Amino acid sequence: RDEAGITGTWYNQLGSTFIVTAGADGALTGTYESAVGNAESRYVLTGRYDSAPATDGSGTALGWTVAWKNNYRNAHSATTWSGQYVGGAQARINTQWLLTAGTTEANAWYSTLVGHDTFTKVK
Amino acid sequence: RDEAGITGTWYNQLGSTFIVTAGADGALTGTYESAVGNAESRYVLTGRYDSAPATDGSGTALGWTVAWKNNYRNAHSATTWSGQYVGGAQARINTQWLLTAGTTEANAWYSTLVGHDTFTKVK
Amino acid sequence: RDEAGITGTWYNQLGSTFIVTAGADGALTGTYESAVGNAESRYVLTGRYDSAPATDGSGTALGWTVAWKNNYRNAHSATTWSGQYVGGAQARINTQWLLTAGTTEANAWYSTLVGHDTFTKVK
Amino acid sequence: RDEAGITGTWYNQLGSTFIVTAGADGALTGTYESAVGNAESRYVLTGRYDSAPATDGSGTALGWTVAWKNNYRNAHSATTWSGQYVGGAQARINTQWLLTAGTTEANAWYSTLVGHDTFTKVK
Ligand SMILES: O=C(CCCC[C@@H]1SC[C@@H]2NC(=O)N[C@@H]21)NCCN(Cc1ccccn1)Cc1ccccn1
Ligand SMILES: O=C(CCCC[C@@H]1SC[C@@H]2NC(=O)N[C@@H]21)NCCN(Cc1ccccn1)Cc1ccccn1
Ligand SMILES: O=C(CCCC[C@@H]1SC[C@@H]2NC(=O)N[C@@H]21)NCCN(Cc1ccccn1)Cc1ccccn1
Ligand SMILES: O=C(CCCC[C@@H]1SC[C@@H]2NC(=O)N[C@@H]21)NCCN(Cc1ccccn1)Cc1ccccn1
Ligand SMILES: [Cu+2]
Ligand SMILES: [Cu+2]
Ligand SMILES: [Cu+2]
Ligand SMILES: [Cu+2]
Ligand SMILES: [Cu+2]
Ligand SMILES: [Cu+2]
Ligand SMILES: [Cu+2]
Ligand SMILES: [Cu+2]
């Protein structure tokens, strides 16, 4: 189904680069490079996608996580993207995301940022 | 650090069961069984955690994804949990989550549910 | 400041119509007409905005609520939009929103949808 | 219905104080005092609630907004709470919230915090 459609390099509206392989078993593996924030170079990502989506024209549900630690920096935080892949001539992955920081209990009420990223095969 | 603290069986307030192994490399692997919704038995999960958290008393950031397809059912959806592990005698994983369904474009505006789950080692 | 910039008719990407008056005291009052969902005609809205925003080029924070009851229908739900107004030749109100339904306790875990709407003065 | 049940003083898990009047017309008016963050004393709030909820045991949908400007401080931000009132001997208002700051366009990707507050009549 969308193994081929999902696998590859994607770019979001911030200029970040999402490099992913979709496995036959529903796995997502690859790397993420954020153009913004406390981040440099690539970070490991892993996630899952619906490997047998509906055939009624609906998108394909998926999600993935990055923990913001690599050999260069550690931002003590993790983002999860939850979204759907929409195939076609202008393929897209439309997501919403939650970025949680490790905090003290006193600061936990502001631990989590929320936003939305749209990924395309171009740009 | 928290490899040992995170690895194991966790339970949330809904009675769902989160079985996870935290790898030395920052990986999270395991299974999720939801007590609610269009779900039965176990589903694969994968995620990431900060394997070198701060030492100032802050929690450990992490996240993981489940795509709601297994050998029994397919709910054409995926949940990502984004949160932090808080160690101690009453250890907890405090999360917020995004559940995205595969939808048509016309229905995409209501594709995504949001909520919050707290996981404990007991119950 | 942005009393004049905010007051007026706005339209989002779904074709919904947001008619608002920004008061000198920080109040937002007006009506909302959703182009989608269990909704017809106008609904009352009320909200608040920062009536003395920063002068460093930042946007103006604001939010508002609609309860989805009017003389025609009652969808037993409420949406809150939380966002910022960005002035200029292409003025925008960029929001994220939470739509909560009245549910039984058993169904409360899926009470809340999340999304994002961008409002413009045109379309 | 819940005009009487909602009107009054509520407290959340952070120790914040939510003072609200529910009008016959679906209006919510009152003040909010946050125990945390860049806030002191009371701030105006306004919102809406379903004034004719379902009779099947479901909660009552509601939401409200605070812009974090008063005579003492201005945090250039606004929170919206979206939730439901659940009546009974242990009445509760269960919410999720979005706190948006006024930001530059470059920083807009981290403009919005998300969390969840539970309000009770005691504490
Ligand atoms: O910056 C990071 C890691 C990189 C995140 C990039 C995001 S992921 C979603 C979005 N999509 C992208 O492609 N890129 C971005 N984590 C901390 C975020 N902090 C704010 C922030 C924003 C800008 C600069 C520094 N900090 C929060 C914080 C909470 C406590 C202490 C410290 N910080
Ligand atoms: O139910 C599932 C899979 C299981 C999710 C369990 C969640 S994960 C977060 C939370 N924490 C847990 O431990 N369990 C729950 N996905 C569809 C959710 N749908 C609603 C829903 C709720 C209850 C029953 C059926 N559907 C939405 C929908 C959107 C379009 C079409 C159809 N459905
Ligand atoms: O549809 C409404 C009211 C109108 C909402 C329009 C939103 S507000 C955010 C976004 N921006 C807009 O301009 N329009 C939309 N409330 C129920 C939403 N339900 C789903 C839904 C989606 C489509 C059709 C019917 N239902 C959920 C539900 C949970 C339990 C029982 C029943 N329903
Ligand atoms: O603090 C406020 C106003 C009060 C919010 C209290 C919230 S409302 C939800 C929750 N429930 C409550 O009862 N109280 C809290 N706004 C800025 C939040 N900022 C973080 C923050 C957290 C702690 C201390 C200072 N700042 C973000 C920021 C983004 C850019 C620049 C500056 N700041
Ligand atoms: Cu930061
Ligand atoms: Cu199917
Ligand atoms: Cu469902
Ligand atoms: Cu450090
Ligand atoms: Cu509905
Ligand atoms: Cu200022
Ligand atoms: Cu702040
Ligand atoms: Cu009804």
D116-A102-B78-A6 Cα dihedral, nearest 10 degrees? 140
Determine the Cα–Cα distance for residues D43 and D27; give it in Å rounded to an integer.
17
What is the bridge-based pairing of β-strands C92-101 and C112-120? Answer: antiparallel
Percent of residues in chain A assigned helix, strand, coil, to nearest 5? 10, 55, 35
Determine the Cα–Cα distance for residues A114 and A107; give it in Å rounded to an integer.
17
Determine the Cα–Cα distance for residues A66 and B49; give it in Å rounded to an integer.
8
Q: Is A110 exposed, middle or buried (0-12, 13-18, 19+ CB in 10 A)?
A: middle
Determine the Cα–Cα distance for residues C44 and C74; give it in Å rounded to an integer.
13
Instruction: End-to-end CA distance of chain B: give it in Å, rounded.
Output: 25
User: C70 CB under 6 A from ligand 3?
Assistant: no
What resolution in angstroms does the PDB record give? Answer: 1.3
Q: Do residues B17 and B36 make contact, with C-beta atoms less than 8 angstroms apart?
A: no
Residues of chain C neighbouring A114 (CB-CB closer than 8 A): 96, 114
User: C79 CB under 6 A from ligand 3?
Assistant: yes
Strand partners, D69: D74
Q: Which helix (H) or strand (E) holds B66?
A: strand B60-69
Could you tell me which of A110, A104, D118 has the C-alpha nearest to residue C105? Answer: D118
Determine the Cα–Cα distance for residues A57 and B105; give it in Å rounded to an integer.
9
SS3 for C98?
Answer: strand
What is the secondary structure of A42-100 as a DSSP string? -EEEEEEE-SS--SSS--EEEEEEEEEE-SS-EEEEEEEEEEEEE-STT-EEEEEEEEE
Q: Do residues D101 and D114 make contact, with C-beta atoms less than 8 angstroms apart?
A: no
The number of folded domains in chain D is 1
Kindly give the distance from the C-alpha atom of residue A100 to the centroid of ligand 8, in angstroms, as a whole number.
Answer: 15
Determine the Cα–Cα distance for residues B94 and B59; give it in Å rounded to an integer.
10
Which tokens sit at A64? 């993935």
Determine the Cα–Cα distance for residues B56 and B123; give it in Å rounded to an integer.
29
- Atom 22 of ligand 1, nearest CA residue: A37
User: What determination technique applies here?
Assistant: X-ray
Determine the Cα–Cα distance for residues B58 and C107; give it in Å rounded to an integer.
33
**CB-based contacts of A102: which residues, under 8 Å, 6+ apart?**
A76, A77, A111, B50, B53, B54, B58, B59, B60, B61, B84
Kindly give the distance from the C-alpha atom of residue C25 to the centroid of ligand 11, in angstroms, as a whole number.
Answer: 23
Residues of chain D neighbouring A98 (CB-CB closer than 8 A): 114
What's the residue count for chain B?
Answer: 123
Strand partners, B115: B97
**Is D81 annotated as contributing to ligand binding?**
yes
SS3 for B105?
Answer: helix
Which tokens sit at C24? 């000198």
- B27 shares contact with chain C (CB less than 8 Å): no
Strand partners, D61: D84
- Measured in angstroms, the CA of C103 and the nearest CA of chain B are apart by 14
CA A78 to chain centre: 11
**CB-based contacts of B61: which residues, under 8 Å, 6+ apart?**
A67, A68, A76, A77, A78, A100, A101, A102, B49, B50, B53, B83, B84
- Distance of CA D119 to CAs B4, D8, D11, D94, D123, Å? 35, 12, 5, 6, 9
Could you tell me which of C25, C22, C14 has the C-alpha nearest to residue C45? Answer: C22
Could you tell me which of A32, A39, A36 has the C-alpha nearest to residue A17? Answer: A32
Q: Is C12 exposed, middle or buried (0-12, 13-18, 19+ CB in 10 A)?
A: buried
Annotated binding site of A: 32, 43, 81, 97, 109
Which tokens sit at D20? 């609200």
Q: Residues C73, C78, C83, CA angle at the centre, nearest 5°?
A: 130
User: D79 CB under 6 A from ligand 4?
Assistant: yes
Mutate to test the pocket of ligand 1, among A76, A79, A116 (most ligand atoms within 8 A of CB): A79
Among B36, B109, B115, the residue with its CB nearest the CB of C36 is B109
Q: Do residues A41 and B24 make contact, with C-beta atoms less than 8 angstroms apart?
A: no
Domain ranges, residue D81: 3-120
Kindly give the distance from the C-alpha atom of residue C122 to the centroid of ligand 1, in angstroms, as a whole number.
Answer: 32
- C118 shares contact with chain B (CB less than 8 Å): no
3-state secondary structure string, chain D?
Answer: CCHHHHCEEEEECCCCEEEEEECCCCEEEEEEECCCCCCCCCEEEEEEECCCCCCCCCCEEEEEEEEEECCCCEEEEEEEEEEEEECCCCCEEEEEEEEEECCCHHHHHHCEEEEEEEEECCC
Could you tell me which of B121, B32, B21 has the C-alpha nearest to residue B62? Answer: B21
The CATH number of the domain holding residue A73 is 2.40.128.30
User: Taking a contact as any Cβ pair under 8 Å apart, which residues of chain D between 71 and 110 contact chain B?
Assistant: 96
- Atom 14 of ligand 4, nearest CA residue: D34
